[PDB]
């Protein structure tokens, strides 16, 4: 899925719009743009793709009271991620001995 | 916006579908359904409404490398929420004195 | 762990301080106070016990440079969580028919 | 706070344990170890210092029942955060034209 970058050139973003010059099927080139506002969204600070997943990922739906939809929904897949923390923030040398402060 | 429940009756959820009998403008009633799969979505276990907000809430967009969009995006508005924690989890009586363990 | 409330009586909270009258091991009672501010955190609106134990879920720890701890850590395990959404936010009665607006 | 690395040398990490050779206040050096497992936590894949200080952002604390601390706490303050998304996930070159797929 996707992978435009493998056959497009001079790609650029300006505001919400992606522009690039892409190889046509039969050897030519074409410059075109796509407005990302219609395909990505900001959820609490993090960009994600827009789509539907409610049927795919939720279960045991109920109506509570007059208008509350309640359900059980599956959280994101687990992965390993690289992380770091600076030990100098809280680890001190206290007369020759390492101590948290 | 919304507020169907103020003029609809016998609302129910089955799977992803909401069904209700609503007052018509000129006095009658009508039973109709709406499939919530096209209007809500599960983000990391939490239900939200689908929609677009990229232009509304993000800034300083850039293309890093061949295909990474980088931006700065506004997080959710701050509010106060009611919360509880059971002090019996960790607070002990140690011979007459309250101690964390 | 904990369970002070099984042998302590007439507890009170004032700000971050818990006070109670607790049974002594050998008879009699003692009144004491504990400032919970040093052991409870506010995480995005929820009270939570101060946490640690990173090594249970992190691998390949290394020192980077003079002071940085670097590792590969697991994100939250995938599970089903309870979630709710108020359908009155966006579902309307439009002349007898339920519509997203 | 902290800053052990300014006056400690030849530091090493093994598992959750930091080891270093540190200057003593009056001359000379001492070697010591500190288990970081009791003060650092894995929060959704990021290493974080053990946190507390709930009262700075919570109000109206009260004791509910015999052992429940109840309050109203602020969620994360609204800010702009940096975020990124790989457009190669879903943007394709479709015969010379950029399209979502």
* SS3 per residue for chain C: CCCHHHCEEEEEEECCEEEEEEECCCCCEEEEEEEHHHCEEEECCEEEECCCCHHHHEEEEEEECCCEEEEEEECCCCCEEEEEEEHHHCEEEECCEEEEC
How many C-beta atoms surround the C-beta of residue C33 within 10 A? 12
Chain D CB contacts of A29 below 8 Å: 96
- Domain containing C83 equals 1-101
Give the contacts of C48 (CB within 8 A, at least 6 positions apart): B85, C40, C41, C42
Using CB atoms and an 8 Å cut-off, which of residues 19-58 of chain A contact chain D?
A: 20, 22-25, 28-30, 32-34, 36, 38-40, 42, 45-49
Alpha carbon C101 to chain centroid distance?
Answer: 36
Chain B CB contacts of C87 below 8 Å: 2, 4-5, 18, 36
Give the contacts of C11 (CB within 8 A, at least 6 positions apart): C4, C5, C18, C19, C20, D63, D66, D67
Whether A81 contacts A64, CB under 8 Å: no
Residue A36 DSSP SS3: helix
Chain C CB contacts of A72 below 8 Å: 80-83
**Contact at CB, A93 and D22, closer than 8 angstroms:** yes
Burial of residue D17, with CB atoms counted within 10 A of its CB: 0-12 exposed, 13-18 middle, 19 or more buried: middle
Residue D86 DSSP SS3: strand
**Contact at CB, C32 and B98, closer than 8 angstroms:** yes
Half-sphere exposure of B90 (CA within 13 A, CB side): 16
Spatial CA neighbour of D85 closest among A45, B18, C99 = A45
At C50, list the tokens: 């101060």
Give the contacts of B65 (CB within 8 A, at least 6 positions apart): none
Could you list the beta-strand ranges (E) of B24-79: 29-35, 40-43, 46-49, 58-64, 68-74
At C53, list the tokens: 């134990």
Residue A17: phi and psi, rounded to 5, are -110, 130
Resolution of the experimental model, in Å, one decimal: 1.9
Give the contacts of A18 (CB within 8 A, at least 6 positions apart): A11, A12, A33, A34, A36, B63, B69, D87, D91, D98
Chain C CB contacts of B83 below 8 Å: 45-47
Alpha carbon B93 to chain centroid distance?
Answer: 40
State how far the Cα of A44 lies from the Cα of C13, in Å rounded to an integer. 33
**Contact at CB, B13 and A63, closer than 8 angstroms:** yes
**Contact at CB, D70 and B77, closer than 8 angstroms:** no
C81 to B36, B47, B92, C23, C42: CA distances (angstroms): 19, 11, 30, 40, 20
Spatial CA neighbour of B57 closest among B75, B36, B31, B39 = B75
Residue C4: phi and psi, rounded to 5, are -50, -35
Q: Do strands C46-49 and D46-49 pair parallel, antiparallel, or not at all (unpaired)?
A: unpaired
Residue D94 DSSP SS3: strand
**Contact at CB, C90 and B2, closer than 8 angstroms:** yes
DSSP string, A54-98: HHHHEEEEEEETTTEEEEEEEPPPP-EEEEEEEGGGTEEEETTEE
Residue C79 near chain D (CB below 8 Å): no
Burial of residue B18, with CB atoms counted within 10 A of its CB: 0-12 exposed, 13-18 middle, 19 or more buried: buried
Please compute Rg for chain B using Cα positions. 24
State how far the Cα of C37 lies from the Cα of C18, in Å rounded to an integer. 10
State how far the Cα of D71 lies from the Cα of C15, in Å rounded to an integer. 10
Q: How many helices (H) does chain B have, and how many strands (E)?
A: 1, 10
Residue D3: phi and psi, rounded to 5, are 60, 35
Whether B18 contacts C85, CB under 8 Å: no
State how far the Cα of A58 lies from the Cα of A56, in Å rounded to an integer. 6
Give the contacts of C50 (CB within 8 A, at least 6 positions apart): C38, C39, C40, C41, D50, D51, D52
C-alpha torsion sign, points B50, C100, B1, A62: negative
Spatial CA neighbour of C62 closest among D91, A40, D16, D23 = D16
Q: Which chains touch D (3 or more CB pairs under 8 A)?
A: A, B, C
Chain D CB contacts of B88 below 8 Å: 67
Residue D61 near chain C (CB below 8 Å): yes
Structure determined via:
X-ray
The H-or-E segment that residue B56 falls in is helix B54-57
Q: How many CB pairs under 8 A join A and D?
A: 146
Count the domains in chain B.
1
For residue A45, the distance in angstroms to the closest alpha carbon of chain C comes to 14
């Amino acid at each position: 899925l996707g992978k435009f970058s493998q056959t497009c050139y001079n790609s650029a973003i300006q505001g919400s719009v992606l522009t690039s010059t892409c190889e046509r099927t039969n050897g030519g080139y074409n410059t075109s743009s796509i407005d990302l506002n219609s395909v990505i969204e900001n959820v609490d600070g993090s960009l994600k793709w827009q789509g539907s997943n409610f049927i795919e990922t939720c279960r045991n739906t109920q109506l509570a009271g007059s208008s509350e939809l309640a359900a059980e929904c599956k959280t994101r897949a687990q992965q390993f991620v690289s992380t770091k923390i600076n030990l100098d923030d809280h680890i001190a040398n206290i007369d020759g001995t390492l101590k948290y402060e």
